[PDB]
Amino acid sequence: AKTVTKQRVESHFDLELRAAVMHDILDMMPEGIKQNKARTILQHLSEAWRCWKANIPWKVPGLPTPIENMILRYVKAKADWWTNTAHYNRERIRRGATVDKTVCKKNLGRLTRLYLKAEQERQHNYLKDGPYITAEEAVAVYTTTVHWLESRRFSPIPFPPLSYKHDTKLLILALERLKEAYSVKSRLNQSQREELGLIEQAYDNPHEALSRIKRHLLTQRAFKEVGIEFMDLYSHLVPVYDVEPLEKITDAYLDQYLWYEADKRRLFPPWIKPADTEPPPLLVYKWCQGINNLQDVWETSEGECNVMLESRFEKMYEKIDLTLLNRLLRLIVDHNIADYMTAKNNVVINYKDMNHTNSYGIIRGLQFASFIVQYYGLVMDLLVLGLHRASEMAGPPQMPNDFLSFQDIATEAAHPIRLFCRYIDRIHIFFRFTADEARDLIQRYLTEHPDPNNENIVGYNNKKCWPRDARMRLMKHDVNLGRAVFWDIKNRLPRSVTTVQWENSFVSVYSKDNPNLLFNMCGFECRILPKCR
Amino acid sequence: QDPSYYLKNTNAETRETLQELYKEFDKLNAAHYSTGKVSASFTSTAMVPETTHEAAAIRYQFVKKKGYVRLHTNKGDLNLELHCDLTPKTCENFIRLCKKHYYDGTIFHRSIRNFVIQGGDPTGTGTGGESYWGKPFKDEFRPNLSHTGRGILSMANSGPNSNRSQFFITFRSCAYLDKKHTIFGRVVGGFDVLTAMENVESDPKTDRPKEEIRIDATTVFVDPYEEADAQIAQERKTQLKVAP
Amino acid sequence: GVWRNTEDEILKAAVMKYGKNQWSRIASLLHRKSAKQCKARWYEWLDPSIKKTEWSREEEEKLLHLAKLMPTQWRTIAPIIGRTAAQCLEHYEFLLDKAAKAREKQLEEARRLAALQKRREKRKRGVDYNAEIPFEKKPALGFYDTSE
């Protein structure tokens, strides 16, 4: 007999599964009954497994209860084997121990099916359990946004007019942005050739294309389905969305118009990054120089401590409530534009034989999704910093500040939060504390979270890329200060909108005990050491 | 806890917004195939996960064999046997018409030239009368005993959910009453009286006779629907002395 | 993106022949049409479960209520009221405007004709069933029998 080798695993398992079900038919059926109909039961088992794979509700209306119990039990066995194989193959792929194209493609398909099952679960749980935002949190967010826009004397973005001055230039920029992806001149397919023909048709007759775009912005609120697939980066998967090209042209023009109007009307304060002014290594250098050029930043003679906090917003994109998003976007733009913005995100996501309606999360495959992400991040920056320190950081609206400058030394020293930067969802905050404020913060954190056995060292994380002298020295006071700072930051953000996790974050303290200040901006691990220390 | 928890430095219009918002504000029914909630909730993540099987409900007029009703109309006393297994809705509608006086004392609904004669409807317009539920019950024609042949008694209707009390004895085979009128059964007595009623002169505009065959009396020679109601009442009264 | 009635009839026949989940097989028949276009045309207009009736009072009350609750989310609103997103969006706009075999036998006959022509002019390790019993199993004997 032939052994069961690797290429003969899966089918053989199915064969064995079939045989087991056949045995469980032949002793379940009572005395009599000439028509066994076991082939029909095996077809029902295959259909139940295929409905499990596509997240389709499987229910035969008339079917005997022990046969249904048998089918559900064996389908759960097959699903457990499938999911454990997917987990083991993903661990082997991330470790690099497997160089196999079929294993990689099969595992990518399995994880796509598992993700869409979890996403459909999340959408149904959002529609059943109600909005997580409650009532007063959304009212407080809306009121804070209204007060911030009133404080900045912001002029709202109008509709694109009938004879706009720069509409052809924005159309040319959007068409070049769409023609960027098809410059390989490969074999393509039917849909890519259709998109390229639509791009050329809009390029030849820009006036008709602009009229169709403004008609789509004014009228349509229901859209076609979007395709989804995944890029395997071998450590994580990246969702890639596919949109109908007419909607892609309209969304690209809307993205260009919205970003030009927001830059002209100065909606975004200069701490929101990536700006167009600098590359991210220049952002790293400007952050280091803004740390270095603070007033008495390295003086630790009186117990002053510097705290550098780096974190993310975790599931920021998945928790943007669309009604609250529409109410927030109505503060900025015309209502038809914001209705298009909200209604574009409520579409049907398709993959092979699965369809689900996206009602809670945002879709990052939209051309204008970056504007919504940075606007929601502006709202989160207002929640973190507060209105007073954000108005101090942005300066007066008649004379706005640059990225890391203030109007005065007294405006710098009025708050512990010296520097702030947000890179899409990454958060980098630089605090400077005196001794009394740090002692009070440590006292309040130990009042809420007591720890007499000094176990805060154990859960604390450190940068392992540096040597032992270059790493953070883990004294009790600096560790307690870092945990106090992280607890006070985490208390500001409501968990319904976004959360900040300790494991994905890193807090470094510069004091008399720690001479090095460690952080990680973009792909750069940076260690700052003063010449005094 | 309190709504002002997770809320410090409340704004003005936040406070009047929340103030305005708060100022504004079964044993014998076990059908053995169960509900489909467990299998659909397991195979799909779009429902609430239920882990225990629940048996599906089923009364569907659980009667004993076929009924037989003797209608004494102006043609005479004719007995018709309605098959409850072929159509329980048609036999239940005929028994409710003969029981709740929708057919007793009623006029002839229709009468064709030796094709079909309809009676038992109090309106007499072809599909009048009332069923057991008041509104007209669902209509379905069986293939074993359809509304074809001589003396085929059917709950006369223009389609489904329209047969209430109009009982039509078809004297000829026709496909028009198939899958439109719920076929109860066949006439087992009074064939000469039914043939004389069908062979009389009738107005073809309303498809009814000049002299309406009015059912003077109704008798239950065999009542399957009343026996099913008595069995359902016995099953209810088996657990009613301690469940009030 | 236009849809002739001829293409709608061909699409209806292709759905009734090939089921639901096949779309590229359906789109092979329709010239200058894609499978995504065929699926969208079926699920938007040509599906028989689409309610092509008039709105009731209850349907309009639920539509106005749900449009007040969840603004401009028609893909969520539409399965609650049972209509599609385009019909309910158009009706909501209208309500706001109002408020304002034989071959093998022939081959065998030709082979028999060639065999008779060769007879008129190995065994490949097989079993000849016409010569004797292929696997002779004698019946069991007991208490009777005098043969024949």
Binding site: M29, R50, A138 | - | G19, M70, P79
Partner: peptide
């Protein structure tokens, strides 16, 4: 114990708090 043939495919309520949230936003 009757088993119907397999019809192969290859061969909703809203929580009320939603409403309250919408009303709050309008106010």
């Amino acid at each position: 114990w009757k088993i119907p043939p397999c019809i192969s495919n290859w061969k909703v309520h809203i929580n009320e708090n939603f409403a309250k949230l919408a009303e709050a936003l309008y106010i």
